[PDB]
Amino acid sequence: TGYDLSASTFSPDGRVFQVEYAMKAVENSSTAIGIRCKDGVVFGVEKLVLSKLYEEGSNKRLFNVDRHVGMAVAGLLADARSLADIAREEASNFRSNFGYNIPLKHLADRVAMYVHAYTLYSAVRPFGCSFMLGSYSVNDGAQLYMIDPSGVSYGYWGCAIGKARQAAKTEIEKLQMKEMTCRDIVKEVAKIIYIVHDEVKDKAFELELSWVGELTNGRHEIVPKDIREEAEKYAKESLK
Amino acid sequence: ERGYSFSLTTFSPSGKLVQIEYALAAVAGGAPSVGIKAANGVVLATEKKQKSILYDERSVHKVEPITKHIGLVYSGMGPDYRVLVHRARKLAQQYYLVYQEPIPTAQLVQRVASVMQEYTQSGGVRPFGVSLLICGWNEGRPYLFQSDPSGAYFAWKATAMGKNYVNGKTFLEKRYNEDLELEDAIHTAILTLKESFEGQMTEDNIEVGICNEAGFRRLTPTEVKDYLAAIA
Amino acid sequence: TQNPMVTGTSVLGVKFEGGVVIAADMLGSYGSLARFRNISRIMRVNNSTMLGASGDYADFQYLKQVLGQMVIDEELLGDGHSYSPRAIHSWLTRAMYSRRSKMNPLWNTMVIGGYADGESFLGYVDMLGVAYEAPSLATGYGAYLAQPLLREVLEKQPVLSQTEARDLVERCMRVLYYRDARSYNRFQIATVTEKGVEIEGPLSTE
Amino acid sequence: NQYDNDVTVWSPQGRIHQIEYAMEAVKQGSATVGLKSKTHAVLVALKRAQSELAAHQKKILHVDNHIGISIAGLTADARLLCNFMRQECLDSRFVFDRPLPVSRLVSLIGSKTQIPTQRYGRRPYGVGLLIAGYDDMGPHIFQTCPSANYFDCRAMSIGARSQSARTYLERHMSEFMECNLNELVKHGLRALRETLPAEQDLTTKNVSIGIVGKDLEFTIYDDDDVSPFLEGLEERP
Amino acid sequence: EFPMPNEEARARIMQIHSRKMNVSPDVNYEELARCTDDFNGAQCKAVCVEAGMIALRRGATELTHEDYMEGILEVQAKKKANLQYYA
Amino acid sequence: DRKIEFSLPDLEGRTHIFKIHARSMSVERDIRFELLARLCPNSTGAEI
Amino acid sequence: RSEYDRGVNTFSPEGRLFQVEYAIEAIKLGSTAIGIQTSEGVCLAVEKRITSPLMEPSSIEKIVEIDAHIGCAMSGLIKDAKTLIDKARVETQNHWFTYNETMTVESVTQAVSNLALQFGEEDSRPFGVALLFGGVDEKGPQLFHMDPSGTFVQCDARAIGSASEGAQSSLQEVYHKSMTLKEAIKSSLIILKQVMEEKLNATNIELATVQPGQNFHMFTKEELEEVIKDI
Amino acid sequence: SYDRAITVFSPDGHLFQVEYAQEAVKKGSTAVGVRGRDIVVLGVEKKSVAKLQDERTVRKICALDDNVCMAFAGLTADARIVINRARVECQSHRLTVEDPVTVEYITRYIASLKQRYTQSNGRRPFGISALIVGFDFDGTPRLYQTDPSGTYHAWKANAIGRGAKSVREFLEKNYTDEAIETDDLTIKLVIKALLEVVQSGGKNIELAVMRRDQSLKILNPEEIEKYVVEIEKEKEENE
Amino acid sequence: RYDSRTTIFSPEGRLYQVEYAMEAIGHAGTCLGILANDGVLLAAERRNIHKLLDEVFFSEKIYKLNEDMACSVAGITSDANVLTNELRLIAQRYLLQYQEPIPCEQLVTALCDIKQAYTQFGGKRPFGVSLLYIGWDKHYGFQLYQSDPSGNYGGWKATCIGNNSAAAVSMLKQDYKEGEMTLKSALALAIKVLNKTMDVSKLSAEKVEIATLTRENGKTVIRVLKQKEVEQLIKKHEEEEAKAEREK
Amino acid sequence: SAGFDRHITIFSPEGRLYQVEYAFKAINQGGLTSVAVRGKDCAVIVTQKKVPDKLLDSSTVTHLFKITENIGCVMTGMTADSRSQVQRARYEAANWKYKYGYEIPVDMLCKRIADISQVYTQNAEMRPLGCCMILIGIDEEQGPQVYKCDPAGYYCGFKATAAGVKQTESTSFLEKKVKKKFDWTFEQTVETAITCLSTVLSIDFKPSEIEVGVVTVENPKFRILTEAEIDAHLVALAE
């Protein structure tokens, strides 16, 4: 109280409270897990359909930052969409001024700097959405970076953002992402997401998958519906 | 009147710019500095103590030159002193370029005071928490001025700023004679630092600068050692 | 762009039932000298549209980066909508007309042709912004030499075939080689149909 | 509490309360139903008259030939968003000569609304827009709540007493797809009529109907024009 | 520790205290729970009772969702009017 | 259970209050109570 | 409310902007103005509310000529009313200049609302004035009402000012679609006398009419007595 | 808690800061202005300046243009700025349109400047109410009062500053067509009206008299002395 | 309260910040100026008289603005310096545009307008500097003008601002002979006033600064009295006091 | 006293800026410790490498950032602000090279960094960057140099130093060590730094928990010691 009304006021013990509040806000949303294959990066987000009137694909949380970069925002959807727009702008500017696809590391660093610049001013508030960036390139392998409201962003072999981040990590650490390919890893992602789901507190959800790697010629595209069901079939096979 | 001790752009009922007084207190709560003006030259001395033996005493110098014949010693917040010294150097060089003559101590001091006052007129800008003490030798007459965060400048003959400034001022008016010389002025300044100096005065802990007709120059540890041994 | 440095030859294109075909040389002639001879003057924008232009290749190259990012953004949204060949044409017309108004126009006479929803599109926006729809278009000299020929084939028979289109341009660029001082005997052919846009080449002549 | 003044202050629980209040701003307006069949996107709105002898307030606005909206919220923000969408549609027509996609316009609206919810200086756009349009992918019925989040809905309904319309639309979602213009309009009118209290009835002076279809440009039906659709509606039980 | 009821908690409370009353199967208790943020269990029961009483006012044999919303408005003494600027 | 808010009377409420408190007063027959109600913008029944 | 009503940028729990309603309340402190729209034309009757006999009666402006065919009635803050009226005049002149035609009353009301809408949209406070626009256009006689919130809606016979509620209630009873200008004016004067603190005469009311063919005619001193004679 | 910001509306729709600013006008020396058939008068009270200060720099009646003069109340600091801006506006209006600035136009510009200063924070309202009077109508006398709020009004005779209520009450009950039929009687009316507010001797009333197609004539103390002698004679006749 | 910022008006209609500044002007050292038939003069009190302070300018309170103007100061040091710099800039700008000296009142009005602008626009604190003006112009000759923090100036024949301004002004009113004061008599009256305006007895020459404006052969020479003549005047006043007490 | 610690530009009653001290304390939020030791011909810095998750990528967590091939930095404290300051330092070094030719000396580099921080602290616009910036780098004519320069804007020359949660203990250990004049060799410098960190943290210092960076006169290029070199140095330290 008193030191937590603005993002530019350091707490007496040395902690910017608004950033922690944004982290809590992102913690208040659904789970989104990114798992790095041996030859790609797979994104999976549990997209809760708040009402039956939605169009099975509305407000999807999987965004294509660029051709090779996939983003798996989870949290305040408006902030996530704004961040996706800024990431696309940065990717376009990097390609125009340098001529080659912006490396996932550099794009993540620039977007993280942009996010952190919004937790330093009193006239702006920290982004309430945490996002993970994924891409594949033979030149630089598959990279999966997660940037939260605080602005910190280091690479991950596999990360989960949302309500059941800890539950997702418990059953993701039990997966060998070092060697597996992006074919069975999709089924693993579907199963892990289905495990981390209340199903009594959340009425229903529409699993949406995504991947980028060698199997997709290096580009990031929505997982084909033909094989997406196979992942859904495996998840259903898993009892939870 | 606790209600008006916050903003620098509002007048207290008695008519006191509270923030300026608080900045002056912060200045007086800094490192000691004493300067004496002799008929031949000027002397500037500040106590340079680092919190541990792990600090390179030579990396940061409290006494810095503004031009070939202007000096600077401070007592208060050093980071503010760095910007103050940068502005002073820029002002001196602008005056030199416009007039092709080394900026007189009076004019450089006045412009530094104006720079200081520039920050004490709008909300959102903290007054400079350092009071500068300027040496000089222009037109063959030693000069010593002190510029404060309030923007006022004086012509101190000899004064000590920072911690234990009352004791330094009391020591002055006693060992100060208006007809001294540069060496005697240096000795008096070293003694004045001593009476407000905690611990041994090593060559690396006290930094002094003579600013006579020859110009301003920071005495190297060797000369400071010789002077302290002579006094000791 | 006030004094072109590297320029381009004519650009030819004739529309047939089922798609459109364009071709262009690969001779970047700084002044009268063949500065470069392995450049591509016809690159695709999307699966159902392709373009190629004359004039400053640097100015056109700038257009390549603009369209690529401008085109690439189209599929990033993943909404299904893609810039129709008219859509790119309309953007181009305002793109150069806006640039010309500020005395810095792109000295790059473009031609954009594509196949969309069962109809072919063949537009040409000149270095200044003029643009129209014709069954067959040739940039620069091609208007003088190849363009007159294409009316004769279209006037008597406005319907053409891919092979008839293939040699027609060849009989079009061949005459370009004979009566032109800036042509080159290495050109690409761009074919756009339902199957997509394909670029192949080069090709020579006797 | 004290985290209830600005959009740039984060509540301890993780909510920007000002966004919640902007969202609540929608319910102060009249109920509006927007729904889409295979070829048509019809949205029916209820018009409220300030006085008995005052023209009923306009609720269905015109944006472009293929993009219609229903405003359920602040008149100021509703009109501002309508003007911005009109400008975006005109720019798309001028530069591309092609109808600006409804999805892209909705995304632009969301992006523009997000900024007021992230930077101090102006309140969030307290208007809920039901965007209906026809493009290459068929009819689209979006809802753009003040929270800067838009939902692509088959048949949405915002405004005061809008829960009944939403429930009816959920019940009859199946028939919406394979329905003609008349049946779509009648289902929308039934959804609106469910929202009204027992005493009030769907009269020709307080219903506005907007339709965009395969070959039909946007049309706003007010007063007698609604009569052909209104007649034949089953009397409420 | 007893916390202020959550969304599921408020919905369950409304369901428990609306059992004895003739309630329309069209009521969306989740929407009511969303609309009653910062409501304790006693306030939720008051919302249900006020919805019932309001339904009685109109002579409606069976409660309706709008009646529940009006009861939610009445529970905190709030009054909703047709503002001349929210159209 | 029920929190009744006794807001300041509206114009109709003020007119009715004026009639209620003026029922016994020997007032003339042309007294426009509507004007007196409109001239008391925010006044309770006690002020009436 | 005390913490949420100190700026048009703050949203109340209801979602209400607790500064525009204060603007409406401010408009509630002005002199009553009445406008009746009939097939023959549009009539505007108001209350002078003269404060001193020394003040020039024409100095205080309640009905002004926004254009030759559209009249405006003011009720509320003088400064906001003057600024909005000047903006309406400028907008009408601009429309005439660019389009060589008389802007419709709906168009002029939209133009004035646009300025009444920038109540803090980053290019101050809501314009605390309500304007009753009356005139004849290609659609016939019309009357439009505006509130500080920027909401404008066509009104057949709207009353705004101190006596808005009673004047409107009586207008509902005394208004029909088939009224002529003479009867509409008589009814408006009767209503104003009913809701007027001071006895009606020629020095406390200014009556304005705008009929098709003819221009905005503001009844002069001699004219007003002729109409008040019978009422 | 609604009186600490200009752009904040009170629950009853009051812009309280402007009302407070008018209080500043309520604290100034009284100014009385009455316009005749061929004369416009601006009454003023002198404040009995200190024994050891010069009254040349305390000018309260100043002319914006060659034929328009204004007498103000309230704080002098704002009145001087308003007067300077009015002069610059009159000289700019003459420049753009050769026709001399009308009294109505100068009053409108003063009101516009005041309103612009009372429209947003960081700009304190002008606490001076100006009585602008001038024959600028080219054959018609006009008098205006610009309130600190920003609204102006045409007044046959109005009072501003301390005692404005009493002077206005006197003017209402004495300003009749027979009263101002001649310039001398108009000046006598001004003196009589200002006498009830300022009970004192000579030099306590400064009268600015402007005739048709003429210049301002700040009456010397003797002329005011002559008029007060005449008024005393009239009172003696009444008794 | 209603003193959070200058722009705020009190219910009675008083700029509380401006009044606070005009009250705070009393903390400044005493300065006064007497207008004489042949010229005008200024008197100031050096509050800081420490032995370790070197007098380098001799004009801490009295500044030269133009070749025919000078203005004493009283108030904040930074505000005083800014105001004097702006005064010099305004005077020289007027000289450049019109090629004649500013008629004194023009400079006073310009400075007062600047101060008024500061006291009006929000985010700026009122200039707590009240400075007396002296000078000669072809229009009115010798004049003395008083400037307050509120921008309200005014012609004055003899005024004192700062410490005990009320007593000095009152006893100048008591013993100022209008139109019969010569520069010598003006200096005598100024010394007499300064003697009791300050608590320090004997009116030390080093503790008082006097500057006089004279009109010599069309040059308008501004002269700051040297310590010798100040001591002579102090001794003259002492002898006059002894003569007066002789009656006792 | 406590009411002045909500804005960075407000001075405390005793002459203190509370927000700068608060940022200094926030430096410790990362829970890490970093130490720099300046040898006779080398400069070595070791910082903790905490990876409390099996799914993290240890290669992307390194806190040792290379500002330039000749100058080095180790950010301690808040991660995001530390990375922002590292990017700003890289920009400053690049601009110095572009505008003056010769590589910017480390002292100048983060003197510019500290001036940026101070300008942040003076004008209340942005929260001060809560991350201590420790710089190393061989400078011609001045041997190895390590400079720590912090949020408030203070930069000094250091023979040895440390920033983080365990700063006082590490500095006391260094003072106990720096005093027994001895051959400050590359191996000796690395061993002393690692020993100080181990004693302060009281940890066995597994090779994957530390990250070291050394700049030497013989090889004046920032080099991040790999796991093998760190393990060899640790084994030499043990025996």
Author numbering:
A (entry chain M): 5 to 244
B (entry chain H): 3 to 234
C (entry chain h): 1 to 206
D (entry chain L): 4 to 240
E (entry chain F): 353 to 439
F (entry chain A): 338 to 385
G (entry chain K): 5 to 127, 134 to 241
H (entry chain J): 2 to 240
Provide the publication's sentences verbatim.
The 26S proteasome unfolds and degrades hundreds of proteins to maintain proteostasis, regulate cellular processes and generate peptides with second messenger functions. It consists of a 20S core particle (CP) capped by one or two 19S regulatory particles (RPs) that gate access to the CP proteolytic chamber. The redox-active thioredoxin (TRX)-like protein TXNL1 is expressed in many cell types and was proposed as a nearly stoichiometric component of the human 26S proteasome. It uses its C-terminal PITH (proteasome-interacting TRX) domain for binding, while potentially reducing disulfide bonds with its N-terminal TRX domain but how it binds and is regulated remained unclear.
We initially focus on the most abundant and highest-resolution (~3 Å) state, PSRpt5. In PSRpt5, all five subunits from Rtp5 at the top to Rpt3 at the bottom of the staircase are substrate engaged through their pore 1 loop, while Rpt4 is the nonengaged seam subunit and at low resolution, likely because of continuous motion from the bottom to the top position. Extra density above Rpn11 could be unambiguously assigned to the PITH domain of TXNL1, which forms predominantly ionic contacts with Rpn2 and Rpn10’s VWA (von Willebrand factor type A) domain, explaining its salt sensitivity. The C-terminal tail of TXNL1 draped over Rpn11’s hydrophobic catalytic groove and the insert-1 (Ins-1) loop, which has important roles in binding the C terminus of ubiquitin and regulating access to the deubiquitination active site. TXNL1 interacts with the catalytic groove of Rpn11 through its hydrophobic tail residues F278 and M275. Interestingly, the C terminus of this tail reaches into Rpn11’s active site and uses a conserved terminal histidine to coordinate the catalytic Zn2+. The specific conformation and interactions of TXNL1’s C-terminal tail are compatible only with the closed state of Ins-1, whereas the ubiquitin-bound state would lead to steric clashes and the open state would be unable to form the necessary contacts. TXNL1’s tail may, thus, bind the catalytic groove of Rpn11 only on substrate-processing proteasomes when no deubiquitination is occurring. At the top of the staircase, Rpt5, Rpt1 and Rpt2 are ATP bound, whereas Rpt6, Rpt3 and Rpt4 at the bottom have ADP in their active sites.
